[PDB]
Amino acid sequence: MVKHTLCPSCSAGCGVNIVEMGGAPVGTYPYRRHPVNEGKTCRAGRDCYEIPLMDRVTSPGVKKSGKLSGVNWDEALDKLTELLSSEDISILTTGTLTNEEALKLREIIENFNVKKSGLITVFPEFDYPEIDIRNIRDYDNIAVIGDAITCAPLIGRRIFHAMAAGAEVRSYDRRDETRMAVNSGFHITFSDEREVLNDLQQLPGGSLIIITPEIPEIIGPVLEFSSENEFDVLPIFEDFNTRGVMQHLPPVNEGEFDSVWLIDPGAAAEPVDVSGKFVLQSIRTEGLTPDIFLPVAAWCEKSGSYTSTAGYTMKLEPALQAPEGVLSDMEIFERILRA
């Protein structure tokens, strides 16, 4: 009935309980024991229980003339394997796989000798420190780039704890009324990148830099400056396991996608331009029609590990039962390798 699980809505590692009645998810319950949020959730955390039921597609779909028609799993895994071996396939994944599934995806990427692949994320490959968010209050100086409270409310909670602890918090964004702008010790509405960087020159060594993805072009320079001068960088990634997937799969830095295979079990992928073919492996087609569709289990219907932005890793047993006809991404990968 009541089962522990992770909130998939953002990259904070908040724990929730799913209340299941007769095999279906019916509600949410506070997961007070979880250390990231201690049973506190934003609205999305309390709404996450509806995801496994909303517009769920649970049967493989191969695009017949014009539209998508049902098909058995073997007839899709074939017509996918041939596509891998023959055509120029680029594999793109969101930060919604389990860590083990990401390792398997790396194995596949090597086996089929794909040249372009990786994780969809605006952040680069960095030596991010493993920061405990409960330690955010310890930092004397915290620089916040982007609206961190809105991006991850339960990390903004720790920023508030830090403010109450005496830390001086400086916020930077292109807007001057965001939640961080309102609640920061000092806010700057910069229009030129150096504007923020100069102020970052005033930080002491060992200061915290909480950076969101709202300002993409600043991530590179800020990480370069933080690599120098010894700052601890805390990113706010896009997906609930962007960090875990990035551990194995590099961020995709190509822009010539055709015949792409999108692996988005969490349905978090933004509309991606596909010049050629479009294989979609998700829990709900919605969006546009894909050439092939492989329904998968939801984040809470799997067994596996997820890593939050801070670096907290959580091992999960399924909170629900996967609907008939859907396979975990691990099963798809293993069968594709076997074929």
Partner 1 sequence: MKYLLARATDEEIQRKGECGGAVTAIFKYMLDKEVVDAVLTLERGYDVYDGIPVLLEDSSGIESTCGSLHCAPTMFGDLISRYLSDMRLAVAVKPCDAMAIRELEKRHQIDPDKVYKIGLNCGGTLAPVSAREMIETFYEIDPDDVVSEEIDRGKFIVELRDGSHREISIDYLEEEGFGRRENCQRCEIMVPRNADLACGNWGADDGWTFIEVNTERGQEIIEGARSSGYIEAREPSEKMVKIREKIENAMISMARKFQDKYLDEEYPSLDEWDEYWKRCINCFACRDACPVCFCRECELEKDYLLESDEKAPDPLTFQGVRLSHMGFSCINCGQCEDVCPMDIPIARIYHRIQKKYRDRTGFTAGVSQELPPMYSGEKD
Q: Which residue ranges are tagged as binding site?
A: 7, 10, 14, 42
- Interaction site with ligand SF4 (CB under 6 A): 7, 9-10, 12, 14, 37, 41-42, 44-45, 152-154
Q: Is 311 in the site for partner 1 (CB under 8 A)?
A: no
Question: Alpha-carbon dihedral of residues 269, 274, 280, 282, nearest 10 degrees?
Answer: 10
Pick the closer one to ligand SF4 by CB: 44 or 114: 44
**Neighbouring C-alpha atoms within 13 Å toward the C-beta of 7:** 29
Pick the closer one to ligand SF4 by CB: 10 or 89: 10
Contact 61, 286 (CB under 8 A): no
Q: State which of residues 25, 61, 118, 153 lies at the interface with partner 1 (CB under 8 A).
A: 153
Q: Give the C-alpha distances (Å, rounded to integers) separating 86 from 114, 138, 263, 282, 283.
A: 11, 55, 19, 23, 27
Contact 254, 230 (CB under 8 A): no
- Give how many residues touch partner 1 by CB under 8 A: 35
Give the integer Cα–Cα distance in Å for 245 and 178: 30
Pick the closer one to partner 1 by CB: 17 or 308: 17
Pick the closer one to partner 1 by CB: 42 or 119: 42
Piece of the chain touching partner 1 by CB under 8 A; list 48-56, 177-185, 276-284, 329-337: 177-185
Residue 182 binds: one of ligand SF4, partner 1, none (C-beta under 5 to 8 A by kind): partner 1
Nearest to 45 by CA among 300, 247, 320, 242: 300
Binding residues for [4Fe-4S] cluster: 7, 10, 14, 42
Angle at the Cα of 142 (from 137 to 147), degrees rounded to 5?
100
| Binding to partner 1 in span 8-37, by CB under 8 A | 17, 19, 21, 26-27, 29-30, 32-33, 35, 37
